[PDB]
Amino acid sequence: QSIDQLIKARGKVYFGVATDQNRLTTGKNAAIIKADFGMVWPENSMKWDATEPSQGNFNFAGADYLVNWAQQNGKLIGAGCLVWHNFLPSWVSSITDKNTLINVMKNHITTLMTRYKGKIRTWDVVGEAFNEDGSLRQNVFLNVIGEDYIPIAFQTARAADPNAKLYIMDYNLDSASYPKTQAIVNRVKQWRAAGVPIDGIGSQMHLSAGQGAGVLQALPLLASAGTPEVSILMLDVAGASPTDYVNVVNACLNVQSCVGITVMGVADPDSAFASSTPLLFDGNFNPKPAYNAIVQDLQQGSIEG
Ligand SMILES: O=[N+]([O-])c1ccc2nn[nH]c2c1
Numbered sequence: 001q002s003i004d005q006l007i008k009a010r011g012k013v014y015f016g017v018a019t020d021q022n023r024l025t026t027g028k029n030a031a032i033i034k035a036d037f038g039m040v041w042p043e044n045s046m047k048w049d050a051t052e053p054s055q056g057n058f059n060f061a062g063a064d065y066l067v068n069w070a071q072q073n074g075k076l077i078g079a080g081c082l083v084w085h086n087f088l089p090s091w092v093s094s095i096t097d098k099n100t101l102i103n104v105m106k107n108h109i110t111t112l113m114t115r116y117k118g119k120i121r122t123w124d125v126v127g128e129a130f131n132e133d134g135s136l137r138q139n140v141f142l143n144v145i146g147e148d149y150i151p152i153a154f155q156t157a158r159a160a161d162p163n164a165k166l167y168i169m170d171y172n173l174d175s176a177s178y179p180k181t182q183a184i185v186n187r188v189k190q191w192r193a194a195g196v197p198i199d200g201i202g203s204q205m206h207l208s209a210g211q212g213a214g215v216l217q218a219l220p221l222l223a224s225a226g227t228p229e230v231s232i233l234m235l236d237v238a239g240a241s242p243t244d245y246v247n248v249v250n251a252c253l254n255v256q257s258c259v260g261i262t263v264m265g266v267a268d269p270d271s272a273f274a275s276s277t278p279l280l281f282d283g284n285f286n287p288k289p290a291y292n293a294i295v296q297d298l299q300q301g302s303i304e305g
Contacts, residue, residue: 002036009298012258013260015037015039015260016039017262017263017265018041018262019041021066023265027270028267032285033075033266039121040076048082050063051108063079063115078120078121079124081124081127083108088140093140105152109125122200123167125154125167126169129142165199166199168202169201169204174218181218181221184201185201185221202232203222203230205232206234207235207238209241219254223258229259240288241290
């Protein structure tokens with residue numbers, strides 16, 4: 001059974017997966033994605049160091065392949081991350097002039113979003129902007145531009161493609177009592193109050209065993225920022241326990257504004273954390289216990305009021 005179909009039947013938008021051209025042309029990835037997933041994200045091909053490796057020199061072959069494959073196969077597309085300290089070329093992080101960095105950031109945003117205008121459901125505009133203690137991360141953007149870089153990025157994105165849902169994403173938002181979780185909620189509330197167009201918070205859920213249960217409290221806390229959407233991104237779970245995975249899925253189901261879940265890949269050998277066997281399919285492309293547990297969970301209705 002298809003977990004995407006099953007989650008749609010429970011009123012959600014999608015169950016998605018990260019992929020790219022290499023995956024689609026090897027293994028059984030394309031067959032599994034066609035059958036079982038409803039949204040794709042580029043694993044690597046939309047990163048800044050993939051797409052703009054030197055100034056104004058855009059590389060779109062990989063991203064184009066994924067977007068076209070998704071279109072041809074009737075899948076939604078998410079993409080990102082546009083402004084991120086990760087995977088950022090040294091030509092960017094060496095800029096010291098404020099107006100230059102502002103325009104470099106804006107052109108990166110606008111060029112990527114314009115190319116795919118109208119085709120992308122969700123853009124992750126700003127990623128990993130917070131320190132663990134909840135203060136803003138001192139990346140090049142914060143150091144050179146200051147905290148206005150976040151509002152500027154979102155407004156620029158809204159202008160470039162008003163159809164897209166614009167997200168901020170971060171990791172270690174998996175515990176309701178952790179400082180980072182409350183801090184992103186607080187900052188997003190105040191950005192939105194000031195007119196900054198943040199449509200979603202995406203929680204990047206690279207989990208260790210046993211962390212699924214806590215998401216049942218963290219995800220509702222994230223939703224309390226009042227964004228129209230929240231989502232689960234980059235999901236994998238060390239050990240791939242059915243209990244962890246079912247708890248994450250149920251957190252999504254419990255949170256009205258949660259639109260869906262994206263897993264970080266299809267099969268274990270293709271994970272960056274392969275030795276932790278953290279995905280839903282094994283090295284034979286058979287569904288693992290966790291996949292089947294999710295299927296059982298989604299088939300079984302809850303008693304609603
Ligand atoms: O959910 N995802 O797996 C995922 C992968 C790569 C991304 N880049 N920006 N957002 C992303 C989400």
